[PDB]
Motif scaffolding. Structure first.
Motif, PDB file in Angstrom:
ATOM      1  N   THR A 250       0.800  -1.332   0.027  1.00 52.21           N
ATOM      2  CA  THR A 250      -0.007   0.007   0.059  1.00 52.21           C
ATOM      3  C   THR A 250       0.711   1.207  -0.095  1.00 52.21           C
ATOM      4  O   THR A 250       0.375   2.584   0.245  1.00 52.21           O
ATOM      5  CB  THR A 250      -0.995  -0.061   1.316  1.00 52.21           C
TER       6      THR A 250
ATOM      7  N   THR B  37       1.065   6.167  -3.343  1.00 53.78           N
ATOM      8  CA  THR B  37      -0.411   5.717  -3.175  1.00 53.78           C
ATOM      9  C   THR B  37      -0.625   4.418  -3.894  1.00 53.78           C
ATOM     10  O   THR B  37      -1.451   3.582  -3.207  1.00 53.78           O
ATOM     11  CB  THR B  37      -1.166   6.669  -3.975  1.00 53.78           C
TER      12      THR B  37
ATOM     13  N   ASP C 251       3.058   3.383  -9.607  1.00 52.77           N
ATOM     14  CA  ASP C 251       2.558   4.405  -9.978  1.00 52.77           C
ATOM     15  C   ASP C 251       3.366   5.086 -11.070  1.00 52.77           C
ATOM     16  O   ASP C 251       3.538   6.228 -11.510  1.00 52.77           O
ATOM     17  CB  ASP C 251       2.098   5.357  -9.193  1.00 52.77           C
TER      18      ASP C 251
END
Lengths: 23, 319
Positions: free
Chosen positions: B184, B213, B234
């Motif tokens: 996470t 994120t 990401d």
């Protein structure tokens, strides 16, 4: 003879086959 | 061939292991790895051969000669091998497997039997040797961190946050901190052993770095112990400092258009002996070389035809 052909193929392959060690 | 102070290689899904050198981005030798994908590869400390681990087998490839085949292959486990590594002198190889086990191997063709097994009720995701080659940290799919010392036969269990699987862990070569990331983005940093005397292995959580994120795939320190790079799903790689643990530099492969939709993650990263130029392996069928200061890329190697999920970069001790 088919077994003679199979023996020739297995003979030629086996020489190339074993070159490495498996632990 | 590996007759060079610095070497680097990548591996992926195209069933090849590419070797090259950061001179012009041209490949030297392409080793044939087939019937499985490479989870992670590591070079031997004597710089004689490489070892790539994937799906129940660890295959070693000679660096001195010109051989495309796995001269030495290890079998016996039943699932993937997440990470591998060798003792600082090439005595024993620690392999964390996917199923439940983190074991050691004997690299000598003799009945030495220094191999042990550590079994947990969760699939292993990462193993990290201690810089003193005595302890070993295991990170599994249950957020538990098993600091297991090779001296004794008991291992402590630490859970920063349960129900979330941690993905990687690393210890700086100077043994100053100990970091780890989970699925996470959170990056907990416990203070590692300070008792060099009798391996007290005391842990106190210093801070947590809230970033990434999306999933966080790997975090790695620097050989100078002044930097810490972490890569996320990401399409970013963030390098942080070791003084205040702030955001020193951030790199990204995002094109800025909504037409790509996460075309590739940043799987792995590594530093250099000078802690100035880092190498990153993205899923864009290529690897990149960046500088920790100027931000922009310094080089790109695009010889792969599939994703790239693992890479090894070794250099001379001088730097």
């Amino acid at each position: 003879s088919n077994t003679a052909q199979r023996l020739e193929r297995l003979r030629k392959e086996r020489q190339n086959q074993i070159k490495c060690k498996n632990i | 061939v590996g007759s060079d102070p610095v070497i680097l290689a990548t591996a992926g899904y195209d069933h090849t292991v590419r070797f090259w050198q950061a001179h012009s981005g041209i490949c030297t030798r392409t080793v044939q790895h087939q019937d499985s994908q490479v989870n992670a590869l590591e070079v031997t400390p004597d710089r004689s051969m490489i070892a790539a681990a994937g799906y129940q087998h660890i295959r070693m490839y000679d660096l001195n000669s010109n051989n495309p085949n796995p001269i030495i292959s290890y079998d016996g486990v039943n699932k993937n091998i997440a990470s591998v590594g060798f003792h600082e002198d090439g005595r024993w190889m620690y392999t964390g497997g996917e199923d439940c086990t983190a074991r050691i191997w004997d690299l000598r063709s003799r009945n030495l039997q220094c191999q042990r097994i550590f079994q947990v009720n969760a699939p292993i995701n990462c193993v990290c040797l201690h810089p003193n080659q005595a302890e070993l940290i295991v990170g599994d799919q249950s957020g538990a961190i098993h600091i297991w010392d090779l001296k004794t036969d008991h291992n402590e269990q630490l859970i920063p946050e349960p129900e979330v699987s941690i993905t990687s862990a690393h210890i700086d070569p100077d043994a100053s901190y100990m970091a780890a990331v989970n699925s996470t983005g959170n990056c907990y940093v416990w203070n590692l052993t300070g008792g060099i005397g009798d391996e007290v292995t005391q842990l106190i959580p210093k801070t947590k770095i809230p970033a990434h994120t999306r999933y966080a795939l790997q975090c790695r320190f620097s050989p100078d112990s002044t930097l810490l790079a972490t890569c996320s799903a990401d399409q970013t790689c963030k390098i942080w400092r070791t003084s205040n643990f702030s955001l020193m530099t951030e790199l990204s492969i995002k094109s800025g258009n909504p037409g790509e939709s996460s075309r590739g993650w940043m799987w792995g990263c590594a530093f250099s002996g000078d802690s100035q130029y880092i190498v990153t392996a993205s899923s864009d069928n290529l690897a990149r070389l960046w500088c920790v200061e100027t931000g922009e890329i310094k080089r790109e190697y695009g010889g792969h035809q599939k994703a790239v999920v693992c890479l090894a970069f070794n250099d001379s001790v001088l730097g």
